[PDB]
Each structure stands twice: as structure tokens, then as C-alpha cells.
Structure 1
């Protein structure tokens, strides 16, 4: 029942803070820093999820399943957003800004590194606004695991698509409030959602890369933070 501006305001206030890395740089300790960073970010990510409108209306089981499917996607689009204003670099933390040459120590790391840089350049070429970013991240949370889940499950898939419908209206309204014609509204909406296909592709490579090095957050852990 939230208006478009009420949906934007709720998503902007639910935004998690930018976390930092340990202060006191070696390429040998890089992965320990990034693993520790992602671990701390996940706790704030679950707090943000529980404040995306309509997310806590679902059962905890489906809340867990949605985060199981989208947690790496959400970390990646967050990284890409933080790195948007720093070409050729990924801003994992304000005190942890890495270029492509430092991502060569691990085999297969640079392939995902270049993919993350390309998405960051894509966001840059579009002048993606923060209000559109929080909408795209909310879509990732609800859509990534809605096709891989009884009448209870049918009722909740219907609710997820209802919430996704409001986020779509919110994006359209944001593009209308900004002065875009109708053709530019539908075209930019399509442009944004098509990027989500590549973020999923990046997430699938990240998962594969992490398995070649306790990779996933467990069901009981995701449930413990959610509950």
C-alpha cells in the first residue's frame, strides 16, 4: 500500500552501511581480508532484507531460501555500486581499493574481476542513480530464488510477484519524476533488468571460484540471523 516515494524512502533507509577493512598491504592476506569483509557484510545484509517491504510477510523457510539464492549477487552488485565512481578499480572497502593487477594472484580471480569492472562501467555509462540501485538490489533478493522453491508456496510466490510489481512501478515512477519520456522509461527499465542477467552470471562464476579455494552461509546460520 506504499506509494512510489514511500517505497523509495523505505529502501533508502534500509540501506546497510559501508564496512571497512582492518587498519594498520600484502597480496597474500587479500583473501583473508575479503572473506572477513563478506562475513561482516552478510549480517547487515540480512537486516536490510528484513526491511525490504513485504519480505518478512513470507515464511522464514522462504526467507532463508531467497537469501541462500541471492546473497552473493547482493554482495556483488553492492561492490559494483561502491566502485562505480572509481574506474578500473573495485572498492571492497574505502581502505581496500584494488585494481586489476592485484587480482591476478589467484587463478580464475581476474576473470570475475574484469566482469565486475565491466558492470561498474555499465552502471557508469547509464548514470545509475542510488534510488534505482536500491530497487535493483531488492529485485535480486526477491527474484533470484523464486523459481526454485503446495498452496502455501503458491500464495507466497504470488506475494513475491506482487512486491516485484510495486518495485517495477517504483522504477517507472523514478524515471518519470526525472523527466524521461515513455519510450525512454520502458527502454531504461529493460536496460536495468537485463543487467541483472549478467549479475547472476557473475554470481554463478563467483560460486564456482569460491568452491575451488565452508563456502555458503548455512541454512541454520541464515535462519539464526533471520529469526
Structure 2
């Protein structure tokens, strides 16, 4: 019953651009990770907040990973059709507000349900819930984050849908501080329409069933994770000497 209009050439170009953008900005071999400050995992079987905050053993490495990732997200965003049509001010507002959410989205490629980890190479760059606690975060963020990762995994997104979702996430007209909400919304609509059209004509059943709505729900989930991350980041930042364990970029985006 539902019509399946074909992707317009323009929509085809948009998909090609976003796939190219992602391939240039996401390394599925994790080959740069050895350049980050080394992961350190202190003995913390009990999950002691006092100990976690006293050491922040995993923080330098995860801060470097996140900082690196923000740089990649900036590069990806610059390639979203329409993004450069925005004022610099609006571009920066969108990047700073969406960065952590896009990181959570893009991390799904490395996430595995084999053991519920982000596996980015050997035992060294395998990141578990216990590694995030060692960077000063609490289960109130990490457990819904893992749940989100599983939920996202199970949508079995085509890469086309994955890159569209990240672009839609970034170009959101409802971020605090945006100037030209109408232009951002127009850019987002073009992407949303591409995604909806793609799903309807290129995504096989039964995985296509209400997929667009499930993807929109993930965006809402990300808002919640963003809010919790920000709250926890604030508290983490109270730890004396914490700034040294972060990066200038991380400090700007989250401070």
C-alpha cells in the first residue's frame, strides 16, 4: 500500500557523500589508538568510586580516544551536504552539542554483543563497562549506554542508514543556542527524507518494519545519554588535576 518512491539522484549523491565522509573519518582497524596515552587498569573489582576518582587510570586514554573522535566527527560534519551553508556559530553549536551522541553512534561499529565490549584491537583496546568506571563515570550512564549499543546493534543498520543517522543527529534544529533553526531544519529534513526513502525502497523485510521510527527513537535515547554524560562530566571535572588527564578539545566541548 505504502508507495516506494525511488531515491532521487540528489538523494543518491547525498548517500554517496556521507558514505565517503564516514570511510575517510572512521578507521575500522583502530590503527591510531596506539598513539593515545596508554590505557591503565588499576585493580578495582569492587567498583570503588573513591579509588576510581583517586586514580582515573583509564581517563587519559579514553579522553584521548574521545578527543580524537571529536576531531573525526568535525571532519565528517563538514562533509554533510548543507552543513557548510550554516554560519560558523551555528556549525560550532551543533558540533559541541552533538559530539558525544555521534561518538556513541559511531562507536557501535566496534561494539560487539559477543561479550558486550567495544573491541578495538587486542586486550589493550578492548573497552568494558569496568574501563568506563575507571575513567570516573557511573553505572547510571554506562548501563543505559550498553543497552543503547545493543538496541542499535539489533537494528542491523545498513551503512547508508548509519551515516544518515549520524548526519541527522548533528544537524538538529533543536539544540540550545542555534541561530537559524529554519535552515538547520531544512538541512535535516533533506537528510531525513533521504533516510525514509532509502529504508522504504532498499531495506528488506522484516528488518525494515517501523525502522525509521526505531531510528528516531535512538536519537531521543541519545539526548538522554548526552544529559547524563554532561552531569557526570561536571562531577568528574571537580577532581583536582583532572584537566591534565583530558584534552583542550574535550575541555571545551564538555566544559
Normalising by structure 1, report the TM-score: 0.80
Corresponding residue for 1:171? 195
1:189 lines up with 2:212 in the alignment: yes
Aligned residues: 211
Whether the 8 Å CA contact 2:17–2:80 is kept in 1: the answer is: yes
Per the TM alignment, residue 87 of structure 1 is displaced from its structure 2 partner at its CA by 4.4
Pick one of 178, 185, 199 that aligns with 2:222: 199
Whether the 8 Å contact between 2:39 and 2:61 is mirrored in structure 1 is: no
Corresponding residue number in structure 1 for 2:78: 50
Instruction: Kindly state the Cα deviation for residue 121 of structure 1 after the two structures are TM-superposed.
Output: 0.9
CA distance in 1, matches of 2:15, 2:231: 34
1:78 aligns with 2:106: yes
Distance 1:25 1:146 in 2: 33
Select which of 88, 94, 112 maps to 1:60: 88
Identify unmatched segments of 5+ residues in structure 2: 1-7, 43-56, 237-242
- Give, in whole Å, the separation in 1 of the partners of 2:98 and 2:248: 11
Identify the match of residue 121 of structure 1 among 133, 137, 150: 150
Q: Following the alignment from structure 1 to structure 2, what is the Cα–Cα distance between the partners of residues 205 and 88?
A: 21
Distance of 1:169 and 1:104 partners within structure 2: 39
Query: Which residue is equivalent to 1:211?
Result: 234
Partner Cα distance (1:86, 1:120) in 2: 13
The CA RMSD over aligned residues, in Å, is 2.8
Contact 2:173 2:182 in 1 (8 A): no
Match of 2:46 in 1: none
Alignment of 1:147-166 (within 5 A): 148-149=177-178, 153=179, 156-166=180-190
Separation in structure 2 between the aligned mates of residue 180 and residue 174 of structure 1, nearest angstrom = 13
> Structure 1: any 5+ residue segments left out of the alignment?
223-227
The whole-number CA distance in structure 2 between the counterparts of 1:148 and 1:130 is 31
* TM-score, normalised via structure 2 length: 0.72
1:69, 1:144 within 8 Å by CA — same for their partners in 2? no
Which is further off, 189-198 or 172-181? 172-181
Query: Alpha-carbon deviations, 1:29-64, whole Å to 9, x = none?
Result: 311101111122222221111111100011111111
In the other structure, the counterpart of 2:18 is 11
SS at match of 1:90: strand
1:110 matched to 2:117: no
Q: Greater Rg, structure 1 or structure 2?
A: 2
Deviations 1:139-190 (A, max 9, x none): 11111654542xxx4xx32222222111122112221222459xx56x2211
